[PDB]
Amino acid sequence: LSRFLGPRYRELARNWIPTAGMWGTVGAVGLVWATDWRLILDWVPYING
């Protein structure tokens, strides 16, 4: 897309990146916990068991 290949567009994203990662992280924790994904849960220091 022509408009999205932009300098400020890039700046905006860079500024937006950290927040995005946080959201994925939240979802990740949720998936692991909600679906009891045990491959990841088993490594947790305390909730193991």
């Binding site: 022509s2 408009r3 290949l5 932009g6 300098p7 400020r8 567009y9």
Partner: protein, 98 residues
């Protein structure tokens, strides 16, 4: 290429409904801005041509062959006005990009 363009103009078939080429453009945001900038007489002819084409499509008819729109005669009226809309649109986009 000129004769093959006339043959494709006959094969497209909007001239049989009395339409111009610029009547057949899909009304996006830029097209509606270009239509809004038209003078009153051109806008009224465009609306009458669209209404007549819709009526002919309702009755499943076409115009008589003497009343069709000759390829040579078709006028690209909205085009000039449209380019500007696109130009302005792009300029604004670029400004935001930068």
């Amino acid at each position: 290429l000129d004769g093959f363009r006339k043959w494709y103009y006959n094969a497209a078939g909007f001239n049989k409904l009395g339409l111009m080429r610029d009547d057949t453009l899909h009304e996006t945001e830029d097209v509606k801005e270009a239509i809004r900038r038209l003078p009153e007489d051109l806008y009224n002819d465009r609306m009458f041509r669209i209404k007549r084409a819709l009526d002919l499509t309702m009755r499943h008819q076409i115009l008589p062959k003497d009343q069709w729109t000759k390829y040579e005669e078709d006028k690209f009226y909205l085009e000039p006005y449209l380019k500007e809309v696109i130009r302005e649109r792009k300029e604004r986009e670029e400004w935001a990009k930068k």
